[PDB]
Each structure stands twice: as structure tokens, then as C-alpha cells.
């Protein structure tokens, strides 16, 4: 029993965290095989960040300008290239701790674990979701740039995020491991704002199924709804539309609990129009949307890595 | 900016997780140097759960009864001993991945990270607090016994918990790494119940300071209170008494935000009286009590 916000074990990623220093800027790098990946803004000054030409700044750099430190060992940079908003520093040594890995770009609503690092040293791990507005509500201070987001598939690490910046609202923006930003963001000191956020509906439903598996049933009702009627209500409360793909993904939880997805949608509809009435679900007074249907199955069935 | 429930990176602990099998029972063990630590109930059968005599059961066991598996390698048990509710299995190989470590027994209110394991394999990491009733509100299934709770101090792992059982309410009970249970619990199937839980007041205050550091100030008021008047109010909401030790511990956060502890106590009393009124604090509609003053300073 119990339901917690749970991250993947971070060990396979900890062995890849290195410190990257370029001039006065120090941030984190991901060392996989003989390449260290990090945000390309490491080559910037405070003036450069205002309106940067990264090709012109990088062409002025030499390999010896980048100081890469893995633990108490300095790696020697033998090449440098840029892929979108990520800098790739070729090193002479392949990371012996390199796990089986993939670079994957995730969709909004998908969750992943963040290994927050400072000076190439892992300080914490937390689970979060890529919001529908493409920001992540992370926890990061200055020095955390280059911290990575990941999932674990059997024994394969899927790297899906690299932290680049904090928006004025305190939310975070970053890229996949190919340097492509999630969202309409750029890596420059300019006026940027996150769009209005919405609730990840499929994840709320998956969390309601986790509550039922844990014995919380007060919110269940006799009612069902059409997918269309549910979406009209959901859209009114800034909830993401629930697609037939989402209904199919919730299939196993629906079969396990005996509550059809559209039957759980009617519970969610009433929760939205009426509130919780001083009650909680899994010790929460708000509907939790940072657990995917896969996370719920993984936690309520004990899948290991 | 931002405030998250954050666990310590679990890598140093993952390299110590092994599978321990004794007869039909399989659970997790912690392999440090040449010793594998696990709950002693791994030696129990069906008739040995209501009233087990662990000394009697362990004396009947031999080293070859214990199957220890680290990854796809079987370790050879060369000795066995019992320390309180923990079984110590001496093995013929020292764990090369053994980190710098300490065994620390924590107090209620303290937080730690849990590396939940099944069959000696880590499946997830999450953050817990030792509740004032000495239980932990974990997320554990059958097979998770031997999963450990820990904190990391620079590069040193302080092991503070080993999971032993689930109480009828779905909460969890375990021991420190010396086998001493937290709480009035025993490793028997006898009728056991967690005491009435209370909110960790010092942690709620630390979390209110984290909210102020993050820019959330709506809950602040012009009032202050005496420690005694705060405790009389707090007790009525099932909140733990706030001691002078707690007030002293909140000193650095009080100095950083400019809000005296007793001033923040008055904000907490007002929240307990009014509720949140559709508002949230750090994205939460409830007062969070699983962040200690030390966690808040570290994260902020
Ligand atoms: O925002 C940044 N990273 C950080 C990541 N996570 C949390 C943070 C919390 C506090 C401070 C910084 C955080 C960095 C440093 C700050 N500034 C602003 C700027 N102005 C001139 C040069 N840098 C910018 C602007 C754009 C970009 Cl891509 C990156 C950055
Ligand atoms: O409770 C236990 N671990 C578990 C840990 N975490 C989550 C769980 C979820 C579901 C089932 C078991 C969980 C273990 C195995 C079961 N039983 C209860 C029992 N023993 C004989 C008859 N019923 C006992 C009893 C005492 C002790 Cl010390 C340990 C244990
Ligand atoms: Cl599924």
C-alpha cells in the first residue's frame, strides 16, 4: 500500500554527471561514451546572453577553453560542436560508467525523473511532468543548468531533458538531448513567458485509479459519460482533451478496478463541478496530474531496474 | 526557484542492494563490506509469524540455507548472526561498490529517501518522514522488506531505516540498521496498530518559510503569539507541540526571511483556523509536513 511520487533510481545517470567550466560559467554536463553534452549558453557572458550568435562565439573557442571535470579527474576536450541548443564536447576518454541509453523526446503529460546537479555533483532526484505549456515545475537554483531528465526502460536510460533556464514565474525550460527546446522558448536573456497551463487529464484519471487500488473510493459514482461530453466539461476547467488513445492506455487500470474509463470520467466531472468537500484523495486536496497511467501500473505492480 | 519533494540520488545505495532467499521467502538485503543486512523475519515460515522465537529458528539454520544474490552472481554466506531484528549474513566477498557509510537512528519528523526494491533490484526512489507515531507512509508491496531509508551527507550514506512490515492501515514499520524498531512495533503478526498520527509542526513552519523564500506571502499576518498559546491551538488540530529546540532550529530561516518564528506561528494558527480558501502554498492545498528545516535550507 501507499502511493508516492517516485523517481527512477538515479545511479545509471549519476555516473554520467560531470562539471563543465567555460570562462566564468560552470554548469553540468552529461558524459556518454566520449562526448560531454551541456547547454550551449555555457559559452556566453551576461552581455552575450542578451543577443547571442552561438556559431560566432563557438568559432572563437578552442578545446582548451572548456574545462571538463569528472569527479576529481580532468577530462581533455579534443573537439567541440553544436547541435541546436546543446554543446557536444568530444573528450579523449570514454565514460566507463556509460549505461545502455537512448535520446528520446517526450510529449506533454509524460513524466520523467530529474537528477538535479551542481558542479557536476548530483544533489537530488525528483519526479515531474512536462506540462502541456512545455515547462516543468522543477526545483532548481543557479548552477543547475545541464541537469538531466530521464526514464528507465528495463536497463536502458532514455534521456529526455536537459535543463537550460528558469522563466520569470519560477517554472523551468529546457531541451531534449538533441538540443531542441520543449516549448516556444529560446536560450537568450529576453522577455519570455510560459503559456497558460492546463491539467493533464489522462494522468488525473490514472491517479484516481491508483487511489481506488489503494482503497480510496468515496469519489466513485454510478454515472458514466460520453467522451465528447467529458471533453466539453474538461475544456471548460482548463483540462487537456482526453483522446481515444488515452482511454485505451487506461484500459488495464479500468480492467483491474472494474471502473470503465468513461465511468471514472463521470467521477472526475463531478469532482471538477463540485470540489472535494473537505475530503482528500491519496492525502491530497487537489487532483494530482504528474502520474501517468504507466507510472501507476509500475508503482502498483513493483517493476524493477 | 521551485520547491519539490526531493530524494537523495540513490546510486550509492543501489550498488548495495542484493536479494536474500531463505527457504520460500525472498526479500532485500543491504550489502556493505562483507556483511549483508536484512530483516530477521526472512527465516520465518507460516507457524513462525504469530510467536516466532528467532534465536531458536536461527540456531537451526546453516550458512548454506541463505541464498544471497548480487546481480547475477551468487554470494557465499560464511557466517550468520542476529542483532536485534536484523540478520547479518557474513559473505566471502566485500562489496566493491561499498560507499562511505554510517548507521544513524533518526527521531520523528526527520526525513529520508527510500530506495524501494524487489528481489534485490531497485524499482524507485521517494522521500519519507518518520511520523511522530514512528510509522512511515511509504509505498511498498510484498517483497519490499529490506528496502532502506537513507540520507547523504556530502559523499557519506547515513542508513536510517530498513523496511520490515506493513500495518493494517497501510502505513509501514521498520528498524534502524542496528535492528531496533522505530516505535512500539514487533516483527510478529500479533495485533499491532499505529498510534494516532500528528502533524510535524516544525516541518510545516519550515515549509511556510520555503514558500516565503519562493515569493508566496498571502498567508502572512501582522500577528505574533507566545509559544504556549501556539501549542494550545496546535494541539487542537492534532499538531505536534513546538519546542524551544524547534524555535532555535528555525532561526536561520527566520533571519533569512525577516519573519520571527512566533510571527510565522501566528500565520500557521490562522491557516489552521481558516483553511486555504481555494489558494495553494507551493502548489499544495494542504500544509506539507515532510520537509525539515535542514531540507528547506538545503533545497533553497
Ligand atoms: O536562468 C538560468 N538558469 C537557471 C536554471 N535553473 C534555475 C535558476 C534559478 C536562478 C537563477 C538561474 C537559474 C540562466 C542564468 C540566468 N539567466 C539570465 C542571464 N542574464 C545574463 C546571463 N544570463 C539565464 C537566461 C537565459 C538562459 Cl538560457 C539561462 C539563464
Ligand atoms: O507485511 C509484510 N511486508 C510488506 C511490506 N510492505 C508492504 C506490504 C504490502 C502487502 C503485504 C506485505 C507487505 C511482511 C509479510 C506479511 N506479514 C503479515 C503476515 N505474516 C503472516 C501472515 N500475515 C508480515 C508480518 C510481520 C512482519 Cl515483521 C512482516 C510481514
Ligand atoms: Cl498500461
From Swiss-Prot, chain A:
Cytoplasmic topology ranges: 1-305
Domain Peptidase C30: from-to ranges: 1-305
Subcellular location: Host cytoplasm; Host Golgi apparatus; Host nucleus
Result of changing residue 205 to V: In strain: Zeta/P.2
Modulation of this protein's activity: Inhibited by pyridone-containing alpha-ketoamides compounds 13a and 13b. In turn, alpha-ketoamide 13b (tert-butyl (1-((S)-1-(((S)-4-(benzylamino)-3,4-dioxo-1-((S)-2-oxopyrrolidin-3-yl)butan-2-yl)amino)-3-cyclopropyl-1-oxopropan-2-yl)-2-oxo-1,2-dihydropyridin-3-yl)carbamate) inhibits SARS-CoV-2 replication in human lung cells. Inhibited ex vivo by michael acceptor inhibitor N3. Inhibited ex vivo by compound 11a and 11b.
Effect of residue 145 to A: Complete loss of 3C-like proteinase nsp5 cleavage
Reactions this protein catalyses: TSAVLQ-|-SGFRK-NH2 and SGVTFQ-|-GKFKK the two peptides corresponding to the two self-cleavage sites of the SARS 3C-like proteinase are the two most reactive peptide substrates. The enzyme exhibits a strong preference for substrates containing Gln at P1 position and Leu at P2 position
Positions annotated as active site in the UniProt record: 41, 145
Record cross-link Glycyl lysine isopeptide (Lys-Gly) (interchain with G-Cter in ubiquitin), residues: 5, 90
Effect noted on mutating residue 49 to A: Does not affect ability to cleave and inactivate human TRMT1
Function: Cleaves the C-terminus of replicase polyprotein at 11 sites. Recognizes substrates containing the core sequence [ILMVF]-Q-|-[SGACN]. Cleaves and inactivates human TRMT1, preventing tRNA guanine(26)-dimethylation of tRNAs. May cleave human NLRP1 in lung epithelial cells, thereby activating the NLRP1 inflammasome pathway. May cleave human GSDMD, triggering alternative GSDME-mediated epithelial cell death upon activation of the NLRP1 inflammasome, which may enhance the release interleukins 1B, 6, 16 and 18. Also able to bind an ADP-ribose-1''-phosphate (ADRP).
Assembly and oligomerization: 3CL-PRO exists as monomer and homodimer. Only the homodimer shows catalytic activity. Interacts with host FBXO22; this interaction promotes the proteasomal degradation of nsp5.
Name by which UniProt lists this protein: 3C-like proteinase nsp5
Amino acid at each position: 500500500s501507499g502511493f508516492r511520487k517516485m523517481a527512477f533510481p538515479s545511479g545509471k545517470v549519476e555516473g554520467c554527471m560531470v562539471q563543465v567550466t567555460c570562462g566564468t560559467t560552470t554548469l553540468n554536463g552529461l558524459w556518454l561514451d566520449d562526448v560531454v553534452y551541456c547547454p550551449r549558453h555555457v559559452i556566453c557572458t551576461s552581455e552575450d546572453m542578451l543577443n547571442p550568435n552561438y556559431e560566432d562565439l563557438l568559432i572563437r573557442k578552442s578545446n582548451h577553453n572548456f574545462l571538463v571535470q569528472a569527479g576529481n579527474v580532468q577530462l581533455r576536450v579534443i573537439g567541440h560542436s553544436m547541435q541546436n541548443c546543446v554543446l557536444k564536447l568530444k573528450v579523449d576518454t570514454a565514460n566507463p560508467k556509460t549505461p545502455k541509453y537512448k535520446f528520446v523526446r517526450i510529449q506533454p503529460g509524460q513524466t520523467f525523473s530529474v537528477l538535479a546537479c551542481y558542479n557536476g555533483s548530483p544533489s537530488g532526484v525528483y519526479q515531474c511532468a512536462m506540462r502541456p505549456n512545455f515547462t516543468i515545475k522543477g526545483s532548481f537554483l543557479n548552477g543547475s543548468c545541464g541537469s538531466v531528465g530521464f526514464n528507465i526502460d528495463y536497463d536502458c536510460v532514455s534521456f529526455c531533458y536537459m535543463h537550460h533556464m528558469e522563466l520569470p514565474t519560477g517554472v523551468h525550460a529546457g531541451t531534449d538531448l538533441e538540443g531542441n527546446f520543449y516549448g516556444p522558448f529560446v536560450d537568450r536573456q529576453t522577455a519570455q513567458a510560459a503559456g497558460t497551463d492546463t491539467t493533464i487529464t489522462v494522468n488525473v484519471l490514472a491517479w484516481l485509479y491508483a487511489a481506488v487500488i489503494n482503497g480510496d473510493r468515496w469519489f466513485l459514482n454510478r454515472f458514466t459519460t460520453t467522451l465528447n461530453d467529458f471533453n466539453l466539461v474538461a475544456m471548460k476547467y482548463n483540462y487537456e482533451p482526453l483522446t481515444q488513445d488515452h482511454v485505451d492506455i487506461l484500459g488495464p487500470l479500468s480492467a483491474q478496478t472494474g471502473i470503465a474509463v468513461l465511468d471514472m470520467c463521470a467521477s472526475l466531472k463531478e469532482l471538477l463541478q463540485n470540489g472535494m468537500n473537505g475530503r482528500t484523495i491519496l492525502g491530497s486536496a487537489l487532483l494530482e496530474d504528474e502520474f501517468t497511467p504507466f507510472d501507476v501500473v509500475r508503482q502498483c505492480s513493483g517493476v524493477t531496474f
